[PDB]
Design a protein around this nucleic acid. Structure first.
Ligand code: K
Ligand code: K
Ligand code: K
Ligand code: K
Ligand code: K
Ligand code: MG
Ligand code: MG
Ligand code: MG
Ligand code: MG
Ligand code: MG
Ligand code: MG
Ligand code: MG
Ligand code: MG
Ligand code: MG
Ligand code: MG
Ligand code: MG
Ligand code: MG
Ligand code: MG
Ligand code: MG
Ligand code: MG
Ligand code: MG
Ligand code: MG
Ligand code: MG
Ligand code: MG
Ligand code: MG
Ligand code: MG
Ligand code: MG
Ligand code: MG
Ligand code: MG
Ligand code: MG
Ligand code: MG
Ligand code: MG
Ligand code: ZN
Lengths: 49, 64, 51, 44, 110, 118, 155
RNA sequence: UAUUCCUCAAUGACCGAUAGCGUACAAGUACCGUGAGGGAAAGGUGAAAAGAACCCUAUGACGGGAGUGCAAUAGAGAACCUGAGAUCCGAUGCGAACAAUCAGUCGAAGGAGUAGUCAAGCGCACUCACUCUAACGGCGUACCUUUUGCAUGAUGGGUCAGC
C-alpha cells in the first residue's frame, strides 16, 4: 500500500503536534555538587561517610 | 479469543493467516465496513451482570 | 424565525424573533396522518432503520 | 551464486593483451581505433 | 497572463496554489471565471434582496408585494426597487404613505 | 475638487529632447500644454528634462499621493487625455468602489426597528 | 544599547527535525530555566542546544553589556546545512538515496522587560489557574535545592 | 581540379558554462563493461590576501566582538560576485477543536495596524481614507488529451528552476 497523495504541510503539522516535547515539572539541584537531576536520582552521600 | 472465530488451516498451503478474521466485507456495494464488525481489540475488564445467582448460605457473624 | 418579516432583513444574520409555541398537543392534523405518517431514521448500523 | 567474472591474469593477457591484439587484423584495427580515440589503456 | 500577474492574483490562496505556477494557474483561472459569472449573478441576488425588504415592509401594513408594486405602477410612480427597499428600511413613514397610496390604487383581490 | 477645493497641485512633464519615444510629449508641450496651463490657473505645471529616459506625466495631489503615467510612443491627443484625467482625479488609490452612495445620515425619520409604532 | 544578541552553530551533524524538536521546547524560557530543563531532557540534541544557549548568554554578557541573569530566549530556530548524499542499496538490484544531514542552530536572547518581570512574579504566587503556553514557558518547573545529609536518622 | 593528418594570419547580425567540442576545470580522465565499446560532472572572494592578530563561550570557531577592506553573508579552501523559485525552521496581526466538499467567487459583522487634509478657533470630521484578517450568507464537481459524450472510477503531470 502506497500513499495516494502527497501529505500537505497542514496535515503533517497536525500529525506531529501532539509529539512536541513538554517541560519537566519538578527539577532538583544538589547544593553540594551542583548536579541538576530528576527526583529519585542519587548523586552525593553526605560528609563523614 | 474475542469472538470465537474459526481462523485458518494449520497446513495445506496456508500463508500467514492462521488466526486472522478473513474477509471484513463485500466489494463496492457497500464499499465500506459496517459498524460493529468483529475485529481485534481490548477484551475483559468490563462490567457484566450474572442473573439468578442462588444464595446458599448466610453467615451473619462474619458478614459472609 | 428567519426575520423575513423585518424590513432590515439580512440573510447572513440571525436576527429572528423568539417564537413561543403553546399547546403543542392540540395541533391540528388532517387526513389519516396519525396512523399513516411515519418518521424514519437510520442509526448507522446495517439493518437498523427505525420508524 | 557463482557469477560470470572469474579472474585469471594469463587468460586476460592471452585474449585481450597487446600481442593478442597484434596477432589479427581485427585486433590491429582495435588498437588503431583505440589510439585514435585517445584512450590511456590501449590494450587490456 | 504572466507568471507574476498570476502570483499577484493568487495572493491569499491556501496551500501550494499561491506558490507553484502549475497549481496557481488553474485556481486563478477558475477564480476569474467565478468573477465573470458573479458580476452577472450579483444583480439577481440584489434585486431579490430589495424585493424581500419591500415585501417585509409592506406586509406590516397588510399589503402583499405584488399588489403594492402594481399599485405604484398604476399611479405612474416610477421609484425602482432599490430605492423602495432603502425607503422601507430607513424612512418607514414615507414607505407607509406609499403603501397607503398603492392600496388605494390597486387593492387586488381578497 | 473635494468640496470646491482642487486636489491636483502639480503636473510634472518629464521628457527627453533626444529620444524618439518623446515625440508625442514634445508635440504636446508645443501644442496643447499652453492651453491646459491657461485653463487651470490653480495648477502648477513644471517641465523637467530627463535625457535617455522614457517620458511620463506625474500628478501630485493634496493628499500627498503621486500618480505617474508613462506616455512613451503616444500621440499628442493621448497625452492630453492622460493629463486631463490627472486633472479630473481626486488622487485616490485605484481600488474597487465599494458603494455608489456615500452618506453619513442614512435615515431622516429613523431606521426601522421592532419598537417603531405606526 | 543593543537589544538582541545571537549565537549560531553551523555544521551540526544531526537532523534539523531532531534538533528543532529540542529547540522548540526552550522558546520563551528564561536562559537559566532552559539550561536546567536541557540537563534533564534525554536527547542527543540537548547538549547542542545547551551549547548554543550558553554561547549566546556569554556573547550578550561579554560583547554587548547585557545582564546574563535577566536573559530570556526570544528565538531558537533551525536551518539546513550541507546534506551529504549516498546510495542506499536494496535487495533485487534496486537502490534509493540516503542523506547524512546537517543543520545550523540560531538562538537569540534579550533582556526581560520590567512588565515581564512583574508577570513572572505574578505567575509564582499560588493559584489553580490554567497557564497558557507562553506563561508555562515563563515558569516551566519547580526548582528544589537539596543538601546531602549523612545519617538522616531514618530509612 | 580534390582534400586537410598540419602551419601562419585574419573574420563572424557564431555560442557564452544544461550553450559552445564529449572536455573553458589535468577528459577520452573518473566511472561502467570479460571485451569490442560506452562515457561524465565540475568556471567566477577581493583592485590587492591586506585570507580575519587578540578577547569571549564551546572538545573544537565556521559563532559573537575586534581588526582588514569601498563593501565580510565579499570570510573560501576545486570555492566566498549577483543570489530567484520549489523546500525547511521562526517572529508579529487576525481567524481557528458544534461543524463537511477543486478551497475560490460575490457580499460582509467584527478584530488589528496605520496615514494625511484643513476652517475655525490648536478640534474634528473629512479622505467611499489605506493595509491585513474574515465569523456568517448566496453561488461553484481541477486542468490537459482524446472523444458522440469525461467531475469522471479514461490519459498525463510530486514540486520548482533551466532546456
Ligand atoms: K557535456
Ligand atoms: K558582495
Ligand atoms: K547566498
Ligand atoms: K463562501
Ligand atoms: K485505465
Ligand atoms: Mg472450526
Ligand atoms: Mg484451527
Ligand atoms: Mg510465499
Ligand atoms: Mg504458517
Ligand atoms: Mg465509496
Ligand atoms: Mg576494464
Ligand atoms: Mg536491504
Ligand atoms: Mg525520494
Ligand atoms: Mg529522503
Ligand atoms: Mg554548471
Ligand atoms: Mg551562470
Ligand atoms: Mg559543456
Ligand atoms: Mg577565522
Ligand atoms: Mg565585481
Ligand atoms: Mg554570495
Ligand atoms: Mg521561498
Ligand atoms: Mg502565526
Ligand atoms: Mg463553537
Ligand atoms: Mg473535512
Ligand atoms: Mg472580497
Ligand atoms: Mg455551495
Ligand atoms: Mg468511447
Ligand atoms: Mg459533465
Ligand atoms: Mg482522471
Ligand atoms: Mg470513462
Ligand atoms: Mg500519473
Ligand atoms: Mg518548468
Ligand atoms: Zn550532589
Amino acid at each position: 500500500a502506497v500513499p495516494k497523495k502527497k501529505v500537505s504541510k497542514h496535515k503533517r503539522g497536525i500529525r506531529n503536534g501532539p509529539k512536541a516535547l513538554k517541560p519537566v515539572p519538578v527539577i532538583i539541584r544538589c547544593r553540594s555538587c551542583g548536579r541538576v537531576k530528576l527526583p529519585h536520582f542519587f548523586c552525593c552521600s553526605g560528609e563523614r561517610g | 479469543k474475542r469472538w470465537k472465530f474459526k481462523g485458518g488451516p494449520a497446513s495445506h498451503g496456508c500463508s500467514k493467516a492462521h488466526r486472522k478474521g478473513g474477509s471484513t466485507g463485500q466489494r463496492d456495494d457497500p464499499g465500506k465496513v459496517f459498524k460493529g464488525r468483529k475485529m481485534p481489540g481490548h477484551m475483559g475488564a468490563a462490567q457484566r451482570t450474572v442473573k439468578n445467582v442462588w444464595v446458599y448460605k448466610i453467615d451473619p457473624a462474619r458478614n459472609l | 424565525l428567519q426575520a423575513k418579516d423585518k424590513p432590515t432583513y439580512c440573510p447572513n444574520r440571525d436576527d429572528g424573533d423568539i417564537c413561543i409555541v403553546l399547546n403543542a398537543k392540540d395541533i391540528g392534523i388532517t387526513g389519516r396522518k396519525l396512523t399513516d405518517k411515519f418518521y424514519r431514521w437510520h442509526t448507522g448500523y446495517v439493518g437498523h432503520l427505525k420508524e | 551464486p557463482k557469477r560470470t567474472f572469474q579472474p585469471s591474469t594469463i587468460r586476460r593477457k592471452r585474449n585481450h593483451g597487446f600481442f593478442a591484439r597484434k596477432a589479427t587484423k581485427g585486433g590491429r584495427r582495435v588498437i588503431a581505433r583505440r589510439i585514435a580515440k585517445g584512450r590511456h589503456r590501449v590494450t587490456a | 497572463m504572466n507568471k507574476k500577474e498570476i502570483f499577484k492574483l493568487a495572493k491569499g490562496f491556501r496551500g501550494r496554489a499561491k506558490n507553484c505556477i502549475r497549481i496557481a494557474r488553474e485556481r486563478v483561472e477558475k477564480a476569474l471565471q467565478y468573477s465573470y459569472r458573479d458580476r452577472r449573478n450579483k444583480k439577481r441576488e440584489m434585486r431579490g434582496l430589495w424585493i424581500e425588504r419591500i415585501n417585509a415592509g409592506s406586509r406590516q401594513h397588510g399589503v402583499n408585494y405584488g399588489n403594492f408594486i402594481h399599485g405604484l405602477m398604476k399611479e405612474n410612480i416610477q421609484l425602482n426597487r432599490k430605492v423602495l427597499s432603502e425607503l422601507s428600511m430607513h424612512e418607514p413613514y414615507s414607505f407607509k404613505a406609499l403603501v397607503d397610496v398603492s392600496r388605494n390604487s390597486f387593492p387586488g383581490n381578497k | 475638487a473635494l468640496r470646491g477645493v482642487w486636489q491636483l497641485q502639480k503636473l510634472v512633464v518629464s521628457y527627453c529632447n533626444w529620444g524618439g519615444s518623446s515625440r508625442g510629449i514634445r508635440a504636446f508641450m508645443e501644442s496643447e500644454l499652453p492651453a491646459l496651463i491657461e485653463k487651470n490657473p490653480q495648477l502648477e505645471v513644471v517641465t523637467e528634462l530627463s535625457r535617455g529616459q522614457h517620458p511620463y506625466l506625474k500628478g501630485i495631489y493634496r493628499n500627498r499621493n503621486e500618480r505617474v503615467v508613462c506616455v512613451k510612443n503616444m500621440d499628442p491627443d493621448q497625452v492630453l487625455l492622460n493629463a486631463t484625467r490627472l486633472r479630473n482625479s481626486l488622487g485616490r488609490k485605484v481600488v474597487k468602489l465599494r458603494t455608489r452612495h456615500v452618506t453619513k445620515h442614512p435615515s431622516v425619520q429613523g431606521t426601522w426597528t421592532t419598537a417603531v409604532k405606526f | 544599547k543593543r537589544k538582541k544578541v545571537q549565537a549560531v552553530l553551523k555544521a551540526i551533524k544531526q537532523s534539523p527535525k531532531k534538533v528543532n524538536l529540542v529547540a522548540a521546547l526552550v522558546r520563551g524560557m528564561r536562559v537559566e530555566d532552559a539550561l536546567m530543563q536541557l540537563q534533564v531532557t534525554v536527547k542527543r540534541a540537548s547538549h547542542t542546544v545547551y551549547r548554543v544557549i550558553h554561547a549566546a548568554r556569554a556573547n550578550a554578557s561579554h560583547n554587548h553589556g547585557l545582564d546574563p541573569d535577566r536573559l530570556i530566549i526570544a528565538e531558537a530556530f533551525v536551518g539546513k546545512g550541507l546534506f551529504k548524499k549516498r546510495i542506499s542499496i536494496h535487495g533485487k538490484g534496486k537502490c534509493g538515496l540516503m542523506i547524512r544531514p546537517e543543520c545550523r542552530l540560531t538562538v537569540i536572547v534579550r533582556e526581560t522587560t520590567p512588565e515581564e518581570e512583574a508577570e513572572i512574579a505574578r505567575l509564582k504566587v499560588h493559584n489553580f489557574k490554567k497557564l497558557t503556553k507562553r506563561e508555562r514557558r515563563l515558569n516551566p518547573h519547580k526548582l528544589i535545592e537539596t543538601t546531602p545529609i549523612w545519617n538522616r536518622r531514618g530509612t
